[PDB]
């Protein structure tokens, strides 16, 4: 049956018709990452320290915060950049995924317990629209899907887990793989699985980022100490492929680039879609191996364990900060609940 994400990705990358991993671009990105390796952008602390919307505390509240956001961590792109969902929070302005986090903090500050399953298990579509309200005329995408998943997720947390994601965390016994597995098996919307060449492959974008984010928000300590944190892969979404294609690590075929430039919508499980995700996932594994080797070849001792989580976080932010520079190669478009 099921290949795990890393195995899935290797298999996809090796049998890919429309997407290509370019060793030269793998080298480049590794070296761009090397010069940054001592800075907060490739430390676990950077998750809090570079993102003011992320929770400060390492408590049950923060953990449940990470849960609700990674539960809804899918599909923020809009049809045009002039015409998107924006949320204002404490006099600052956020679009995309950050507009979700703003929306959450905004609700918490209003006093609505949006990070509590007791609440979001029975929250209405009308309430959800309210909480996620935009400050432009344009709504966040798939709000109906965000409502349905909240209700399903809340119920399951209240029934199986005492209404707290901290309980799920503790049950994983400091294993990131077990936490990822528990999540995938307990919460339907996280089942980020499809087909390729007649084998079941897995990506687990949201499940993996949820584990990474649990790790980050608890600062790699306590219930968020994970002995096996380096086993987590990148989180295969639509932005990380874009920024790997920009930097020269990923190459797309004529036909694929055709779709991307015209804004033609991909479907979840389309081969080309699957190939982009799988190749991206494997691409990052290769950049990580390159970087570690470069760090070795300069006879160094890093001050923290570099892993595929941290590279992903970095490259995602890079995506965000350098959007204008990437116009030339668009991100692939899809509407699904998985990313
Ligand atoms: N691949 C990927 N997909 C994603 N969707 C949403 C996020 C949001 N994560 C944020 C927290 C730390 C990261 O630097 C990023 O600012 C994300 C990602 O960090 N990576």
UniProtKB/Swiss-Prot annotation:
BP-aspect Gene Ontology terms: nucleoside salvage; tRNA-guanine transglycosylation
EC numbers: 3.2.2.-
Residues binding queuine, per UniProt: 51, 235, 237, 312-313, 317
Active site: 237
KW Hydrolase (keyword) present: yes
Reaction catalyzed: queuosine 5'-phosphate + H2O = queuine + D-ribose 5-phosphate
Keyword Isomerase tagged: no
GO molecular function, one term: hydrolase activity
UniProt keyword list: Acetylation, Hydrolase
Sequence similarity: Belongs to the QNG1 protein family.
Biological function: Catalyzes the hydrolysis of queuosine 5'-phosphate, releasing the nucleobase queuine (q). Is required for salvage of queuine from exogenous queuosine (Q) that is imported and then converted to queuosine 5'-phosphate intracellularly. In vitro, can also catalyze the release of the q base directly from Q as substrate; however, it was shown that Q is not the biologically relevant substrate. Shows a very low activity on queuosine 3',5'-diphosphate, and cannot release q from queuosine 3'-phosphate and from the 5'-nucleotides AMP, UMP, CMP or GMP, indicating specificity for the queuine base.
Other known facts: Eukaryotes lack the canonical genes for de novo biosynthesis of queuosine (Q), present in most bacteria. Therefore, this molecule must be sourced from ingested food and/or the gut microbiota, and metabolized to its corresponding nucleobase, queuine (q), before incorporation into cytoplasmic and mitochondrial tRNAs. Incorporation of q into the anticodon of some tRNAs contributes to translational efficiency and accuracy.
Protein name in UniProt: Queuosine 5'-phosphate N-glycosylase/hydrolase
UniProt source species: Homo sapiens (Human)
Gene: QNG1
